[PDB]
Amino acid sequence: ADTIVAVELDTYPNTDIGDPSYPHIGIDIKSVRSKKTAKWNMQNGKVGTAHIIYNSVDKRLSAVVSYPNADSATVSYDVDLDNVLPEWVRVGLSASTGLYKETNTILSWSFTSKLKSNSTHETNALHFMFNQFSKDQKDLILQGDATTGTDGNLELTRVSSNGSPQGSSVGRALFYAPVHIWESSAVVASFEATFTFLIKSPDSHPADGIAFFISNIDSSIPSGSTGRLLGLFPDAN
Amino acid sequence: ADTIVAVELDTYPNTDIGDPSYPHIGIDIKSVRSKKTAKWNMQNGKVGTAHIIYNSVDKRLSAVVSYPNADSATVSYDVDLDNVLPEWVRVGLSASTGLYKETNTILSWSFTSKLKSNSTHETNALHFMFNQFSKDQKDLILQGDATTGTDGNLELTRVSSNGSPQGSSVGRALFYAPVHIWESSAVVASFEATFTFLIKSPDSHPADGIAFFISNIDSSIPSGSTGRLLGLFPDAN
Amino acid sequence: ADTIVAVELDTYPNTDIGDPSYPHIGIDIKSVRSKKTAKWNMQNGKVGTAHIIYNSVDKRLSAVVSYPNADSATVSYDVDLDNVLPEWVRVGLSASTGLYKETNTILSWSFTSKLKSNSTHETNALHFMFNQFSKDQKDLILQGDATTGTDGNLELTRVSSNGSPQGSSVGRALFYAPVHIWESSAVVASFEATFTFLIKSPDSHPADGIAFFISNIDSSIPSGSTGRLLGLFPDAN
Amino acid sequence: ADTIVAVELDTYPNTDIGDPSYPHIGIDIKSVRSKKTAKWNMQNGKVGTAHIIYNSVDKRLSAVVSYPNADSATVSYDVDLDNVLPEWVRVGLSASTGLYKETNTILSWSFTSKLKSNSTHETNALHFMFNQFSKDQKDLILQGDATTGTDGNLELTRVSSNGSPQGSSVGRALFYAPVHIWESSAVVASFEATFTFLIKSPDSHPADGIAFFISNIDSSIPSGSTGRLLGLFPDAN
Numbered sequence: 028a029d030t031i032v033a034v035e036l037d038t039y040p041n042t043d044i045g046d047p048s049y050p051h052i053g054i055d056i057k058s059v060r061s062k063k064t065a066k067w068n069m070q071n072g073k074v075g076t077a078h079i080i081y082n083s084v085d086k087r088l089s090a091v092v093s094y095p096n097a098d099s100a101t102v103s104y105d106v107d108l109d110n111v112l113p114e115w116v117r118v119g120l121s122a123s124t125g126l127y128k129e130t131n132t133i134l135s136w137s138f139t140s141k142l143k144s145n146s147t148h149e150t151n152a153l154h155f156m157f158n159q160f161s162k163d164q165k166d167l168i169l170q171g172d173a174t175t176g177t178d179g180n181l182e183l184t185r186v187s188s189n190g191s192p193q194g195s196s197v198g199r200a201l202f203y204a205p206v207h208i209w210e211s212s213a214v215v216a217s218f219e220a221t222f223t224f225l226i227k228s229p230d231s232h233p234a235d236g237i238a239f240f241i242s243n244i245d246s247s248i249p250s251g252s253t254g255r256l257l258g259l260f261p262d263a264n
Numbered sequence: 265a266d267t268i269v270a271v272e273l274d275t276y277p278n279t280d281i282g283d284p285s286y287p288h289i290g291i292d293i294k295s296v297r298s299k300k301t302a303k304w305n306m307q308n309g310k311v312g313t314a315h316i317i318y319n320s321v322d323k324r325l326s327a328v329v330s331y332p333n334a335d336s337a338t339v340s341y342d343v344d345l346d347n348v349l350p351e352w353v354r355v356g357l358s359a360s361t362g363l364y365k366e367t368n369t370i371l372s373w374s375f376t377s378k379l380k381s382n383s384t385h386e387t388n389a390l391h392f393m394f395n396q397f398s399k400d401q402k403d404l405i406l407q408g409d410a411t412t413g414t415d416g417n418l419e420l421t422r423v424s425s426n427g428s429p430q431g432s433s434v435g436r437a438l439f440y441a442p443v444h445i446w447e448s449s450a451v452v453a454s455f456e457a458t459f460t461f462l463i464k465s466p467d468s469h470p471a472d473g474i475a476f477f478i479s480n481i482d483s484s485i486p487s488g489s490t491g492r493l494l495g496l497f498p499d500a501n
Numbered sequence: 502a503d504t505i506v507a508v509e510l511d512t513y514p515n516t517d518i519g520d521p522s523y524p525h526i527g528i529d530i531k532s533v534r535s536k537k538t539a540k541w542n543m544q545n546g547k548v549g550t551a552h553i554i555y556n557s558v559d560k561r562l563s564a565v566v567s568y569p570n571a572d573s574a575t576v577s578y579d580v581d582l583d584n585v586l587p588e589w590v591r592v593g594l595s596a597s598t599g600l601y602k603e604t605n606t607i608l609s610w611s612f613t614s615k616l617k618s619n620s621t622h623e624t625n626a627l628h629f630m631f632n633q634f635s636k637d638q639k640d641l642i643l644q645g646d647a648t649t650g651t652d653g654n655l656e657l658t659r660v661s662s663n664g665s666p667q668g669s670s671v672g673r674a675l676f677y678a679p680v681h682i683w684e685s686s687a688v689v690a691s692f693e694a695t696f697t698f699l700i701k702s703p704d705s706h707p708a709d710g711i712a713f714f715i716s717n718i719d720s721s722i723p724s725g726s727t728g729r730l731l732g733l734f735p736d737a738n
Numbered sequence: 739a740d741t742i743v744a745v746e747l748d749t750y751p752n753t754d755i756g757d758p759s760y761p762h763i764g765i766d767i768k769s770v771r772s773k774k775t776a777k778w779n780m781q782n783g784k785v786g787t788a789h790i791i792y793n794s795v796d797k798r799l800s801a802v803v804s805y806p807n808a809d810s811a812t813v814s815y816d817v818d819l820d821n822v823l824p825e826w827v828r829v830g831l832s833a834s835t836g837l838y839k840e841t842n843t844i845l846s847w848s849f850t851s852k853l854k855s856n857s858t859h860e861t862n863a864l865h866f867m868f869n870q871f872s873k874d875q876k877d878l879i880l881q882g883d884a885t886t887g888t889d890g891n892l893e894l895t896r897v898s899s900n901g902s903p904q905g906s907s908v909g910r911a912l913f914y915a916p917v918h919i920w921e922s923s924a925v926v927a928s929f930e931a932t933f934t935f936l937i938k939s940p941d942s943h944p945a946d947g948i949a950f951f952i953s954n955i956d957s958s959i960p961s962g963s964t965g966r967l968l969g970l971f972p973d974a975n
């Protein structure tokens with residue numbers, strides 16, 4: 028099994044699995060059934076930005092999603108990641124379409140991991156930032172239908188020349204280098220991530236959503252995880 | 265007097281005003297009667313470190329103090345600075361003594377403050393990092409008995425030529441340029457400071473402590489803010 | 502008088518004082534008479550980016566001005582800045598108009614000074630970055646006609662409500678906190694600034710220029726510096 | 739074979755292959771016979787720090803080695819890396835011993851690279867810093883005798899239980915994720931590296947040196963590259 032911690036930008040409400048009756052953002056801890064969600068006003072065609080922050084001091088994961096001139100959705104969950112994650116992990120973005128479809132384009136992405144110790148002045152860290160992706164983005168592990176290059180953007184799910192988004196698609200893109208998310212001697216551990224997304228659909232309701240996840244190094248897309256499972260979890264439990 | 269928000273490293277328990285019967289950590293908002301406290305196994309003679317963090321997402325101010333190969337004190341508090349501070353401020357370090365003394369020596373200090381806008385790539389930030397203080401540190405506003413140069417350190421309170429601390433002393437150090445702590449359009453607003461220190465004393469009980477405060481641009485040690493008032497508040501009311 | 506070092510984005514050619522027969526970029530080591538220049542193909546109305554860098558290992562000052570969809574004009578000179586500037590200085594922007602005029606709008610400004618001492622890795626550093634300029638910017642010393650808050654940009658020179666520039670104008674913008682540009686116990690000294698400008702002129706003869714400058718803490722607009730002197734020098738010597 | 743561009747801290751004078759009569763810092767381009775060098779007052783048994791720097795503006799590679807309060811060696815060379823290195827590479831350290839020995843301890847390492855493209859306000863960048871090497875450092879490709887964890891340091895070559903160094907050893911350490919060292923659209927490409935070391939030989943005649951190299955993704959220790967070849971080049975041709 029895989030250990031998954033993630034913030035989901037869910038566009039399609041699957042009321043049957045406890046989804047709110049509207050698009051939303053939520054914190055997923057080892058399950059597709061969000062521990063805490065927040066109403067989100069999905070804007071079709073408009074480029075949204077999403078900022079996620081976390082630190083072991085207050086032990087609280089938070090996510091803010093905003094569109095220029097428009098409001099912002101926020102959500103926070105009290106979680107001690109050191110109990111719910113391997114010491115080493117791999118960070119990345121996931122997205123998927125199902126019966127309904129949408130474009131899950133990632134215009135940019137940046138991440139910052141920071142491990143401060145008890146020993147004065149000793150600190151380990153990692154940070155990367157992409158403002159444009161290359162066809163051969165040699166530092167991202169592409170998985171599924173994820174492809175880089177087109178217009179310098181990262182397409183997490185299948186699209187066509189018409190610009191049309193294909194249904195039943197699923198893709199993931201995660202940074203090559205393993206992230207050292209925590210440790211015992213660390214007095215303060217905290218990570219921060221930011222990405223800009225572009226989502227638009229031709230049909231009545233877009234689906235299914237983009238998500239930022241943290242997982243163990245060898246994580247591979249679970250069998251039949253398109254649609255409601257956002258390409259992250261193997262079952263809707 | 266004016267507005268002050270601070271995290272205090274209180275080494276001497278002043279019961280009459282609210283100090284618990286032990287050296288502690290605490291969040292101070294517009295008053296010297298802490299909103300939150302946490303025991304702190306003060307290590308006399310040792311070099312300690314402190315980390316202060318805040319962000320408008322979850323909206324909590326928290327601090328952590330540690331010593332190499334030892335425990336770590338922690339304290340957080342819910343506070344929306346938007347309702348407690350002027351949009352523009354100055355940040356600094358304070359210290360003091362009275363009947364009993366101690367050395368409030370700061371070995372290094374750093375600070376970072378960012379303002380993430382609602383519009384993509386609109387981020388305003390400021391960050392300085394003092395790892396070595398000089399005889400004429402032109403970018404700091406030294407107040408009270410604060411001096412620079414001694415071993416490249418920053419002495420907040422008076423120290424005798426041989427090194428011995430001196431009672432009834434009050435000093436301060438404010439970075440020169442004003443900091444734009446918050447803004448109404450900012451989607452995310454945060455800051456974080458860090459400093460290593462040395463609190464050494466001869467007598468049975470060191471006093472009074474060290475503190476990181478944030479106040480309005482124009483600010484100086486309030487009349488009579490010696491000892492238990494840490495040089496931050498004009499009174500204990 | 503004031504000790505100045507500047508990178509000049511010269512739009513109007515003042516052949517009479519050494520200006521090449523075409524708009525250009527040049528390095529000024531204490532005189533308006535550039536120590537070296539390179540042809541700059543201006544792009545009236547296009548937002549461009551300026552990149553300036555320097556380190557004490559090479560003693561070479563370098564600048565690069567580029568536009569989207571076009572080649573860039575690079576320029577570099579060997580100048581031991583510690584043998585020209587004080588240990589502490591002030592960084593800022595300057596712009597002026599003469600008979601003919603233009604808009605010297607600054608969209609964003611960023612700067613970073615890193616002074617790495619000789620001790621292990623005890624580094625000192627300052628970094629500010631603006632991507633949005635507020636109406637009352639308590640951290641910027643405005644001089645001359647320089648205004649802010651206009652579209653969240655910085656207006657170095659004069660402009661009328663209808664976005665029409667004015668002539669015989671001069672304005673400067675200086676960062677508040679002094680900058681310790683050089684130490685003598687540091688193994689490596691380095692700095693860099695980047696700004697994005699928007700120059701639009703109606704009279705088919707844009708004048709006069711923009712310039713990044715480093716000066717003495719108390720620097721100020723010289724008299725009659727408007728026009729060909731870019732509000733930086735008192736004469737064309 | 740592999741394409742190597744390295745900065746060598748050559749402790750042993752192999753006159754037979756161009757090494758000066760004294761220890762030195764040299765710049766190696768697709769060869770072990772340095773293009774340029776400089777005398778190095780190697781201080782047997784004391785922590786030192788090397789600092790590499792390079793940028794595309796003035797296309798120059800420089801290095802500075804220094805021990806606390808002592809001689810500061812320096813060496814530079816003009817080289818357009820984009821015409822020598824693959825658009826994608828890997829970075830890492832390397833050290834070795836032969837008939838003579840020495841401890842090749844790295845106590846910390848940091849790297850940072852940025853790519854400012856023609857695209858206004860859009861950058862790409864990678865930065866990592868290690869102040870402590872974990873027993874199981876999952877983001878480094880240890881080759882040869884390279885081992886981390888011991889004393890929280892990183893041992894590039896063989897070191898006996900009693901601490902004594904061993905002869906005829908070679909080790910490497912390359913960061914896991916590939917580094918997009920350059921790209922056409924980039925108006926300004928530039929990296930920076932910084933690392934502290936502790937070379938000590940229990941006598942007076944040490945050898946053979948350490949080196950910071952940039953190589954093609956799949957570089958492996960050449961056969962017989964011990965000692966004078968520093969585990970970087972297949973032949974001292």
Ligand SMILES: O=[N+]([O-])c1ccc(O[C@H]2O[C@H](CO)[C@@H](O)[C@H](O)[C@H]2O)cc1
Pocket residue numbers: 039041124125126127128234235253254255256
């Ligand atoms: O509107 N409907 O009646 C309706 C249509 C489809 C539906 O589920 C299907 O499509 C979703 C959207 O792609 C997926 O999340 C889900 O995995 C898949 O089973 C549920 C209800």
Ligand SMILES: O=[N+]([O-])c1ccc(O[C@H]2O[C@H](CO)[C@@H](O)[C@H](O)[C@H]2O)cc1
Pocket residue numbers: 276278361362363364365471472490491492493
């Ligand atoms: O021993 N005692 O009982 C005793 C000693 C001192 C005392 O207060 C005095 O010294 C403190 C420590 O310097 C200050 O915080 C305080 O402002 C000042 O009034 C109170 C009681």
Ligand SMILES: O=[N+]([O-])c1ccc(O[C@H]2O[C@H](CO)[C@@H](O)[C@H](O)[C@H]2O)cc1
Pocket residue numbers: 513515598599600601602708709727728729730
């Ligand atoms: O027609 N002309 O040949 C002619 C006209 C004006 C002129 O100078 C005046 O206007 C310039 C552009 O605003 C300034 O650079 C200069 O400082 C100012 O004195 C020079 C030549």
Ligand SMILES: O=[N+]([O-])c1ccc(O[C@H]2O[C@H](CO)[C@@H](O)[C@H](O)[C@H]2O)cc1
Pocket residue numbers: 750752835836837838839945946964965966967
């Ligand atoms: O006795 N000596 O002084 C003496 C010692 C060693 C020597 O060369 C040998 O050892 C070097 C140092 O390990 C290697 O770099 C070199 O590859 C190998 O041939 C030459 C003379």
Ligand SMILES: [Ca+2]
Pocket residue numbers: 037038039040041046235255
């Ligand atoms: Ca759903």
Ligand SMILES: [Ca+2]
Pocket residue numbers: 274275276277278283472492
């Ligand atoms: Ca007290």
Ligand SMILES: [Ca+2]
Pocket residue numbers: 511512513514515520709710729
């Ligand atoms: Ca001119």
Ligand SMILES: [Ca+2]
Pocket residue numbers: 748749750751752757946966
């Ligand atoms: Ca040699």
Ligand SMILES: [Mn+2]
Pocket residue numbers: 035037046047051053061
């Ligand atoms: Mn959901």
Ligand SMILES: [Mn+2]
Pocket residue numbers: 272274283288290298
């Ligand atoms: Mn107290």
Ligand SMILES: [Mn+2]
Pocket residue numbers: 509511515520521527535
């Ligand atoms: Mn000129």
Ligand SMILES: [Mn+2]
Pocket residue numbers: 746748757758762764770772
């Ligand atoms: Mn050599």
